[PDB]
Design an enzyme around this catalytic site. Sequence first.
Site, PDB file in Angstrom:
ATOM      1  N   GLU A 108       0.814  -1.224   0.000  1.00 28.30           N
ATOM      2  CA  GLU A 108       0.000   0.000   0.000  1.00 28.30           C
ATOM      3  C   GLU A 108       0.845   1.270   0.000  1.00 28.30           C
ATOM      4  O   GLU A 108       0.335   2.322  -0.360  1.00 28.30           O
ATOM      5  CB  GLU A 108      -0.924   0.040   1.231  1.00 28.30           C
ATOM      6  CG  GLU A 108      -1.921  -1.107   1.298  1.00 28.30           C
ATOM      7  CD  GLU A 108      -3.062  -0.991   0.306  1.00 28.30           C
ATOM      8  OE1 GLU A 108      -3.162   0.027  -0.384  1.00 28.30           O
ATOM      9  OE2 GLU A 108      -3.878  -1.939   0.232  1.00 28.30           O
ATOM     10  N   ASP A 150      -5.955   6.482  -5.227  1.00 30.10           N
ATOM     11  CA  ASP A 150      -5.342   5.176  -5.475  1.00 30.10           C
ATOM     12  C   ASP A 150      -5.500   4.789  -6.939  1.00 30.10           C
ATOM     13  O   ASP A 150      -5.982   5.567  -7.760  1.00 30.10           O
ATOM     14  CB  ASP A 150      -5.859   4.081  -4.527  1.00 30.10           C
ATOM     15  CG  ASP A 150      -7.286   3.644  -4.814  1.00 30.10           C
ATOM     16  OD1 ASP A 150      -7.853   4.073  -5.841  1.00 30.10           O
ATOM     17  OD2 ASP A 150      -7.841   2.877  -3.991  1.00 30.10           O
TER      18      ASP A 150
END
Length: 176
Positions: free
Chosen positions: A23, A32
């Site tokens: 992540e 994202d």
Amino acid sequence: IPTTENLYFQGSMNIFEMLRIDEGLRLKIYKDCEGYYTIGIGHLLTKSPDLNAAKSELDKAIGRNCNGVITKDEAEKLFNQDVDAAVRGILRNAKLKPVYDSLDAVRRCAAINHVFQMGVTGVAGFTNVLRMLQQKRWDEAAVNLAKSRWYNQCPDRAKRVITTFRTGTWDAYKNL
């Protein structure tokens, strides 16, 4: 042949280090790979396209007026909360718990990662993969995970998890 140092590597890896690699760590709101406002270590703020909504969710999550920015310590606290939520989400679910229980420690990390990324209902919908995992059909499970939208829309965030389900080792997290 693994060196003394190489044999120590598995003791350095755990779910927190694994998700930290997949992540990243970002202290400002960013989008994202699916375009969703995110912060910290993979904390999805909202699926709304409205940054103001994201900032509102952030202040709620952290408990202060952040104006889109947090500290490393705050990112870590939020991360621990999100990891605990994924674990709790698996253990209370009648479909995921028996599969998780059947797995070895490293694949259990892959399982928590998978739920952290997709959510409980998304993962629990992978009927065939779950059966394959429970039956130790690792290559088939990995091929089927590689068909999913989760992996295909954002391969870099999911590829190492898939490898880990295939092998049950931490090798995909070595040599970044």
